[PDB]
Amino acid sequence: AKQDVIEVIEKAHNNELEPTPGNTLRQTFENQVNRILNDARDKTGSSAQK
Amino acid sequence: PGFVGIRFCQECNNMLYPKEDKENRILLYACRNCDYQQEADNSCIYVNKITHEVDELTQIIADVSQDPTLPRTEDHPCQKCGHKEAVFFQSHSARAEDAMRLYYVCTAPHCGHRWTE
Amino acid sequence: EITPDLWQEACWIVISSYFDEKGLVRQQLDSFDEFIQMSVQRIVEDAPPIDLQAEAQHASPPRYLLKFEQIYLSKPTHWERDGAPSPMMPNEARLRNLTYSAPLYVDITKTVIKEGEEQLQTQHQKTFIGKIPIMLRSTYCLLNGLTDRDLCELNECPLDPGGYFIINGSEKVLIAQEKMATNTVYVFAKKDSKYAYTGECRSCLENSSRPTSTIWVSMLARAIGQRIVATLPYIKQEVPIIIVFRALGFVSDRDILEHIIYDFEDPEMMEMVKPSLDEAFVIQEQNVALNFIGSRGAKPGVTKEKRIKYAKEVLQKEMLPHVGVSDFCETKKAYFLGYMVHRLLLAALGRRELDDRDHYGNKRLDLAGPLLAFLFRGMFKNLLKEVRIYAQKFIDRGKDFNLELAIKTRIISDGLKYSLATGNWGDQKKAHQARAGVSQVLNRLTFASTLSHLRRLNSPIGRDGKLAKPRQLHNTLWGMVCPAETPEGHAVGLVKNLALMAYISVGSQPSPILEFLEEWSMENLEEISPAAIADATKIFVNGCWVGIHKDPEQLMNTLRKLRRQMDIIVSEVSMIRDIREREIRIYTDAGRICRPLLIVEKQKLLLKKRHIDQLKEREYNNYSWQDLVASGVVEYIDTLEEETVMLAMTPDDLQEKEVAYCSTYTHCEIHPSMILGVCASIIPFPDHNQSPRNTYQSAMGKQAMGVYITNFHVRMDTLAHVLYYPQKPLVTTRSMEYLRFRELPAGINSIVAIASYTGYNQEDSVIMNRSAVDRGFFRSVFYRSYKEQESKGFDQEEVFEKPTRETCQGMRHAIYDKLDDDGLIAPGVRVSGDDVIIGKTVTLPTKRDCSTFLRTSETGIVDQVMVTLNQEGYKFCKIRVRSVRIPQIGDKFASRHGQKGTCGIQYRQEDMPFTCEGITPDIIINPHAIPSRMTIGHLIECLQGKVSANKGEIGDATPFNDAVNVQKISNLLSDYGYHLRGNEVLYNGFTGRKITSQIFIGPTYYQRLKHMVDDKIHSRARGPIQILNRQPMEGRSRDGGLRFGEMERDCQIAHGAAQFLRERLFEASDPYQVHVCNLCGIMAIANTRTHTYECRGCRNKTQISLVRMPYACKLLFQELMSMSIAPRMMSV
Amino acid sequence: PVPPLSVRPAVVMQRNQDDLTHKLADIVKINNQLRRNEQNGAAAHVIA
Amino acid sequence: FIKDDYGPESRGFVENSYLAGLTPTEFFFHAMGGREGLIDTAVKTAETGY
Amino acid sequence: HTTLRKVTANTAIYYDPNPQSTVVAEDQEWVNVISPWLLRVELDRKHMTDRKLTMEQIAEKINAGFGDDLNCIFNDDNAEKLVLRIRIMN
Amino acid sequence: MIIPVRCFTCGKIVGNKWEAYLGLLQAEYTEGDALDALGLKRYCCRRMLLAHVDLIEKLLNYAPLEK
DNA sequence: CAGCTCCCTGCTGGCTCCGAGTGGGTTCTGCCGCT
Ligand SMILES: [Zn+2]
Ligand SMILES: [Zn+2]
Ligand SMILES: [Zn+2]
Ligand SMILES: [Zn+2]
């Protein structure tokens, strides 16, 4: 998850990240980061319950 | 396009204002205090950039390189002097519509080079 | 040399040195000392001399100056016309309800000229102004520098931190008050207003009598558009800035623009500055602009030359005092105002960003020093403006005057005493206007509570406000304000305590910094032209723009070099270089909150093995924290300088060759656990808990009962709570030895079993061991003190005696034989509710008693009785009563993790579960309190406590230790014959069958809180009644009744119990009957014994109705009739 | 209308009068002063 | 944290659990997060009761 | 809702003594062609083709809002640059 | 204040062990060796001396009320 | 047809509101003087 966040940051820095329609670059970067972190937290939680 | 810049009266050092010399049909800048006139060389009075496509490199200054709190990378070298280490950061500017783009400043002082990638 | 893997001891050794050299109330002590040393001197000297004439003539007048200086202050003294004066012991002041104050003296020189050109000046040395209350353990307190043996000889606690005032024998603590920093420019953008951006700079001279004269420079929010205005103090309307500059003295326009836009090649600045320029092309010279400002003034002059002078005075003194008030400071004021406008334009263009209001770099702390300075200045001005009145009253007749009679010594001392005793910070006339909450009564229930109250900040913003932004924990609170510790009530985030190593700057003169600055290569504003001001950097000193320097680098290094050797710049001064924006600011004022940080060169600390060694052998080499600072190893960094610096949490883990993150560190933290406060530094494993749990523990640490002070037996104090057998925790943080928690602990290391035994702990409650309580577990004693003084009229003399029934008229059924014939009880007598303690009677013009009765349902024993004389020379008695509080069910108990709970049942040792051995848990808590609260720190504490009690070592629970974890603790426990995860096989105490599940059990440090149930339980059955409305009284002490409030009324409506609602609100509170006329609904007059019922205004006397009413309803009707409203109640 | 003693009770030696009783005392003071001035002096200025 | 650090550790993500403990940055961030809920609990009452 | 701020890049005014002179080099005005002080606004293709407008629609909106107090001279939708010039009639 | 007479949990007498415990600590003995030299096998009894703070000594530094 | 009258709209300043209870504590209920 950290590697994915880092590479998303890289894509945003190299202007390689296309803004989501209906959102600006800042909020779409925020959305990607939040999605990655929430997916990581959900997967770790599910592994815990398993 | 360019930007129009205010320049001042040589007599009383005040702001010129645009005027039309109706007889010659030529633009004249007139001080409302004194009778001084001068012919304008730009022919433009007012410019307003609504899209505000701004080159932040002009507002970036060289001494930002010695900031201890800025990140440092050797992956991107400087172009004139080829210095290995470079300091990079984001816009740090309000009303940056959509910009996560990094602005780089070269260390090894007296270089002060600034670029964008 | 470099110190590897010895950090865990080196950092705590240097922390111990810091807490040895500096105490825990160091900010209080330093602020008060600096106040009474220099700020009182400057306040008393800068006051102008008063010259006073006669009434302009006598027949068809000379004056004098009376100037004084050179204040003198003496040590506290006590006796008046009865013996030769003697020093006041602070304990004596506490006992006799005196004010532990010190007299201050001045020498005055009154020089008087009358006629003939002959000048005689008479100087009066040691003139008495008043007595200033003085802080304990201060540099002029009588306990200064005394050894522990001497402090014990004086019945003082060696562990008492001091830092508080004794006034009327009550400890007062000046709570630090936050405020916006002064002399600094803030650009804000309020949402809904006529203007978009506004730049304010509240300004103050070096502690002048003038208040914060705040000036706003604002920009309109949309023809032409975006004009710039500047609302000015003592000016009713906003004034365009260009008019302000022309009034200030700049006739031209290029000169004005040279002070705002520093580089003329930037046309974007010009395009926004010209809309304000073209607004004011009708004013061209200074005098018309002065007239324009004067017309807008609060006091508009009638003629032109009066407005000119008024506006000139406003520009000279009201606007921007900190940049200078002198004959010619126009250029400097213009430069600073143009800088303010430039700052506003930078925010408008987006070149910079808006300043944050919650950024505690922008905040300043008003400690005892600054607060007492602000209040003493006003009282001193009031004293001068009455010396002047006395002088006028004698010189109008012109006979002579006496300065000894002129000086009213009452005003200064009484103002200080009133302000510190009440908390209303200001003049007594404006009690409602002055802000309250300052100088609270010191909380003396636990030593940790006392430390927390002595280290506390306050945000003077309105409470009960829906704007949560001020209340939120700001990022700049790292290491200077405890994140966990804050009250949970309506003061969340507003009342915040102080971090451990956080220190508040005390202030010093910036003049040495000024002379140092002016001699390297910088230029003052008057010397240079704005041609070269754009490429260079602007220097600010205490917020005033001093000059310009071409080379920011190697001057920043020079300033740091001097500060690291303390050559000219003291350690508290902070130098801040903004780099992307060219400002370089130096701050020296008081109230800057700062904390010590290590110095880091290339990638190595300046702290070395030699430093650690020579400081470890302290008390012989005396290499103290001050020597460590002088070595250039540590610096004090405030929030401003913390913005422009790069820190590392741990030198070992963050300064090494690896995948590079920064590799450009500048400072390192001594230990991250120092970001906590005092009450939050006693939490074991606080990073293993949910933060609201830590906040609740920081709140309840002030309520845990223990030995709150060593001299609690000499300390005659109301509501004193001490535990029989306090214990230092088995598992502790390394920060407790600096809070002295292991010397005055509040709690007992109980063996808890987190299990559901019977169900009496289900909802967050707890079972206690009855046998342990019998053995003395959490047993405490409650001290309550009763005071009384005899006196008050010409013949109504109060006297202590045994009231005798035939002599005194009014008496309770209480037995008075327990009193001795002097009117008091001898110590050691059993007492109970409604038992007389102080027999006091007043002469009746036979006699009526005013005897003090013991508070109902207390039922204690008198401990000691003291008799003395108050400051009025009347007999004064204080009596302290012991009452032990055996832990019963309902008593509120809590752990060090915010797991509170009242005892639900107490089982004996036989009824209590037990291990394979005879170990029965002292405490059983519900396991259903862990999973939602998530106090994993509680479980780790319970594990480490067993590990420690088996190993013989004291457990270590430093928050960020990283050298101990659950796996290591489990492996250590497994070596002692126990299950590695702390679980044990308990047996049922009743049946003997072993419990199917295995019980988690181990020693955990529980605390007993002050919230006993015997202090809260009360009932009522037609008790006492209020006087205004005949409803039941309010309060447990007054035998009052509970409030059947507006929501309970609504709940009964929803139940549809109308008869019960009427019973509650009518018969159970105040049944009453009134007589009302049938013709007019006005209350009539009833004479029941003669049965004569007449309603005047009608002359009926025949048709009269009786209606049953609540007394509150009758009194509402009477109030309405007093308001001329006529509520007429016809029964038809 | 002046409210009765029940609306504005006076406690004994804290006798201490009520906050409304003090205002009523001011009312009667100024009413008597205004009355006596308006017959005897009739200055028509201090009356305002 | 270095300037303009949008990484998970630099903006409040806590990759540690309540067992491993919180690194001091994560502890401060969690305290600041819980402070918001604590403030909301007190502020909400004066509106809800009204 | 769309204002003309949303679609324009920058706005500039000049003093052209003759509309025929074309102080700015624009052959479109040369081929297309009474006040000397004129107005010039540059739009962008991005928002223009996002919201599907035309220079004809913008010009007719101007003419309806302000009447025949001004004449808009717009470049065709063929050049890379999006220009419309504004005068004021007498 | 003073060492409790009995352990709260166990009830084993601990009141007589404090002075001997301090004497043993006034030697090479560690706490873990002093506790079981005094015969404290259960940690309930061990914590009684291990975590005890002896405040009676700080209390005795003050002059008494009488003479 | 130009000038005067009136009714509507728009905008600004002003007033009232801001959980339920509960336990404690504290100071404060004027002072100067002048007949
Ligand atoms: Zn001119
Ligand atoms: Zn370079
Ligand atoms: Zn009637
Ligand atoms: Zn035991």
CA distance C111 to C113: 7
For C598-639, the DSSP string reads EEB-SS-BS--HHHHHHHHTTTTS---HHHHHHTTSEEEEEH
Q: Which domains does chain F have, with CATH numbers?
A: 1-90 (3.30.1360.140)
D interface with C, Cβ–Cβ below 8 Å: 1-4, 6-7, 9, 11
CA distance E1 to B21: 62
What is the three-class DSSP state of A23? Answer: coil
Whether the CB of D15 is less than 7 Å away from nucleic strand H comes out as no
Are C419 and C439 in contact by the 8 Å Cβ rule? The answer is yes
| CB < 8 Å to B76, chain A | none
Max CA separation in chain C (angstroms): 117
Q: Which two tokens stand for residue E40?
A: 């909301």
CA distance G48 to G55: 14
Q: Which two tokens stand for residue C570?
A: 């003291």
CA distance C884 to C858: 10
Question: How crowded is residue C10: how many other Cβ atoms within 10 Å of its Cβ?
Answer: 21
* Residue whose structure tokens are 């010695």: B66
Are B88 and B105 in contact by the 8 Å Cβ rule? The answer is yes
CA distance C678 to C597: 19
CA distance C588 to C544: 11
Inter-chain contact C493–E47, Cβ cutoff 8 Å? no
Q: How was this structure determined?
A: cryo-EM
* Residue whose structure tokens are 């103090």: C233
Task: Assess B70–E contact: CB distance below 8 Å, yes or no.
Answer: yes
| CB < 8 Å to C250, chain B | none
- Given phi > 0 = left and psi -120 to 50 = alpha, else beta, which region is C754? beta
B113's CB contacts (< 8 A; 6+ apart) are B78, B79, B80, B81, B105, B106
Query: Treating both helix axes as pointing N-terminal to C-terminal, what angle do C936-951 and G43-50 enclose, rounded to 10 degrees?
Result: 90
Find the DSSP H helices in C952-991: 966-974
Q: How far is the CA of C664 from the centre of ligand 2 (A)?
A: 19
Q: Resolution of this entry in Å?
A: 3.2
Helix (H) and strand (E) counts for chain E?
1, 0
Q: Which amino acid is at C579?
A: I
The secondary element (H helix, E strand) that includes residue D30 is helix D19-40
For C414-437, the DSSP string reads HHHHHHHHH--BS-STTTTTSB-S
Q: Is C764 a catalytic residue?
A: yes
For C876-937, the DSSP string reads EEEEEEEEEE---TT-EEE-TTS-EEEEEEEE-TTTS-B-SSS---SEEE-GGGHHHH-BHH
Positions of chain H reached by protein Cβ under 7 A: 12, 17-29, 31-33
Question: How crowded is residue C940: how many other Cβ atoms within 10 Å of its Cβ?
Answer: 26
Inter-chain contact C351–B12, Cβ cutoff 8 Å? no
User: CA of B20 and C1' of H3: distance in angstroms?
Assistant: 39
* Phi/psi at C664 (5° precision): -140, 45
Task: Tell me the β-bridge partners of C783.
Answer: C720, C882
Residues found in chain A: 50
Task: Assess C909–G contact: CB distance below 8 Å, yes or no.
Answer: yes
CA distance B36 to B29: 8
Which structural domain range is residue B85 located in? Answer: 56-116
CA distance C451 to C985: 42
C565's CB contacts (< 8 A; 6+ apart) are C630, C632
Residue B44 annotated as part of some ligand binding site: no
Whether the CB of C1015 is less than 7 Å away from nucleic strand H comes out as yes
Task: Tell me the nt nearest to C419, Cα to C1'.
Answer: H27
Task: Assess E7–B contact: CB distance below 8 Å, yes or no.
Answer: no
Catalytically annotated residue among C414, C578, C764, C1014: C764
Using alpha carbons, select from C1061, C758, C1122, C798 the residue that is nearest to residue C913.
Answer: C758
Find the DSSP H helices in C955-1076: 966-974, 1046-1055, 1058-1062
CA distance C458 to C491: 9
User: CA of F67 and C1' of H3: distance in angstroms?
Assistant: 29
The secondary element (H helix, E strand) that includes residue C330 is helix C330-349
Are C1094 and C1084 in contact by the 8 Å Cβ rule? The answer is yes
Question: How crowded is residue C49: how many other Cβ atoms within 10 Å of its Cβ?
Answer: 13
Nearest chain B residue to C352, by CA: B93
CA distance C597 to C641: 11
Question: How crowded is residue C1035: how many other Cβ atoms within 10 Å of its Cβ?
Answer: 9
Are C162 and C350 in contact by the 8 Å Cβ rule? The answer is no
* Phi/psi at C21 (5° precision): -75, -45
CA distance C20 to C628: 13
User: B88: domain CATH number?
Assistant: 2.20.25.10
Using alpha carbons, select from F37, F43, F36 the residue that is nearest to residue F84.
Answer: F43
For residue C1033, the 8-state DSSP code is P
Q: How far is the CA of C535 from the centre of ligand 2 (A)?
A: 20
Task: Assess C932–D contact: CB distance below 8 Å, yes or no.
Answer: no
| CB < 8 Å to B117, chain A | 14
- The ranges assigned to domains in chain G are 1-67
User: CA of C1064 and C1' of H19: distance in angstroms?
Assistant: 22
Task: Tell me the β-bridge partners of C789.
Answer: C876
Q: Which C-chain residues 617-656 have CB contacts (< 8 A) with chain E?
A: 646, 649
Are C704 and C151 in contact by the 8 Å Cβ rule? The answer is no
Using alpha carbons, select from B74, E26, F11, A10 the residue that is nearest to residue C664.
Answer: B74
Q: Which amino acid is at A23?
A: N
Using alpha carbons, select from C775, C762, C748 the residue that is nearest to residue C1008.
Answer: C748
* Phi/psi at C229 (5° precision): -120, 165
Q: Which amino acid is at C734?
A: R
Q: How far is the CA of B109 from the centre of ligand 2 (A)?
A: 8
| CB < 8 Å to C255, chain B | 13
Q: How far is the CA of C1127 from the centre of ligand 3 (A)?
A: 12
Q: How far is CA C487 from CA C439, C696, C938, in A?
A: 18, 8, 22
Are C155 and C91 in contact by the 8 Å Cβ rule? The answer is yes
Q: How far is CA C532 from CA B57, C527, C549, in A?
A: 22, 11, 10
